[PDB]
Amino acid sequence: EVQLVESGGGLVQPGGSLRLSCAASGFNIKDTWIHWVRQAPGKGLEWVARIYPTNGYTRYADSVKGRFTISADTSKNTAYLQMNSLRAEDTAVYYCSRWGGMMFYAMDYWGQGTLVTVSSASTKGPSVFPLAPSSKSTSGGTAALGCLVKDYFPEPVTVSWNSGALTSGVHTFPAVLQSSGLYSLSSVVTVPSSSLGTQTYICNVNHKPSNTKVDKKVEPKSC
């Protein structure tokens, strides 16, 4: 029942600002220390800041000292990271965590994290295209299907299949940046070959930054 949930991350122009929130439940933040830790894509963990909410005591990593401010509101049981003068190098997933039960020097609960992308590019939703085998393709009884989730920005996108009912054999590939400066990925799934043309397969794509959601039915092409 102890939980932390971050919110407020998103796309922002360089030199801009953004405020992250960290809402607690199952515990009271006045009993704790709250911390923020970030992870640049592909990189390690980098402690950002901490606060003791009861008395306002804060400490920061050199890397953000003078641009970021960690604060908290004990009544909303919610902490914040105010980030000013953002730079490319601040692009990262931001996590909030705590110290629990007088057990200091141990971050025991963390949120899921929230991505902050520092860029001049504008948000753009994906186009979603079916990945279906050629009508003349053969198989040994297992066939692959997928969705091509092309030309979006920033990260992330999520993909499910058949509204979550199809999970086994699903691979959603890490996005790749194209030379255009837009992401693309594919999501694939392996299914019985006999079920093609009989069973419905829909990929459910959600690009929250652009509020773009698509449900694409994938079938082999009528020739």
């Binding site: 050629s134 393709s137 692959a144 997928g146 691979h171 594919s186």
Partner: protein, 217 residues
């Protein structure tokens, strides 16, 4: 400033192996100053999870195969019997200083037996071609080890420089990888050619596997 030097930076081990990872302080540290070293495990797309605190204390709920120990400047995380689900990056953290710092991380991969990819090719959709571009995709599914080579040919012309690859994180149950290769062509170039082929070379394949289609079939 004071730092932890984590080693090795990556490793691969089989299920059941005992694994040990090391964290070493950067400087000399006056006697009696404690570092209260913590160890965290981080799986792809998830927050780090606490394993060990104050050097040697097993955090509640964490399997007993994890243990920490310390002595002086040197700390060690030990996984006594590696499991498939222990694929992750492991980090130490030191509290000699405020702010504290983390080690660089150690990527743990699970070794397993060779497994050949299953290979599938996908033509571009008519919908995309309308917009001016053709993406052709090749999928290599559930293979080990991660290293693989994909070669694209269009009417037997080797394509070089117009594809991108993506690889999944190691699977937490079967320890395999999958990989996609996507070939980009203009709609004009796609329409000028017929045979589209993906050739895969992998350790698990006695010779390369080629999957193709013909445009318009």
């Amino acid at each position: 400033d004071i730092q932890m030097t984590q080693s090795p930076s990556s490793l691969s081990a089989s299920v059941g192996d005992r694994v040990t990872i090391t964290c070493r302080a950067s400087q000399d540290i006056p006697r009696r100053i404690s570092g209260y070293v913590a160890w965290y495990q981080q799986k792809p797309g998830k927050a780090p999870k606490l394993l060990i605190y104050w050097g040697s204390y097993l955090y509640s709920g964490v399997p007993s195969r994890f243990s920490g120990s310390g002595s002086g400047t040197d700390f060690t995380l030990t996984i006594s019997s590696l499991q498939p689900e222990d694929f992750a990056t492991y980090y130490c953290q030191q509290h000699y200083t405020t702010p504290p710092t983390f080690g660089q991380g150690t990527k743990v991969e699970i070794k397993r037996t060779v497994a050949a990819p299953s290979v599938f090719i996908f033509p571009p959709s008519d919908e995309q071609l309308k917009s001016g571009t053709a993406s052709v995709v090749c999928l290599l599914n559930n293979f080990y080890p991660r290293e693989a080579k994909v070669q694209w040919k269009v009417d037997n012309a080797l394509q070089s420089g117009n594809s991108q690859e993506s690889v999944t994180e190691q699977d937490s149950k079967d320890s395999t990888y999958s990989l996609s290769s996507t070939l980009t062509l203009s709609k004009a170039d796609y329409e000028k050619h017929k045979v589209y082929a993906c050739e895969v070379t992998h350790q698990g394949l006695s010779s390369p596997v080629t999957k193709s289609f013909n445009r318009g079939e």
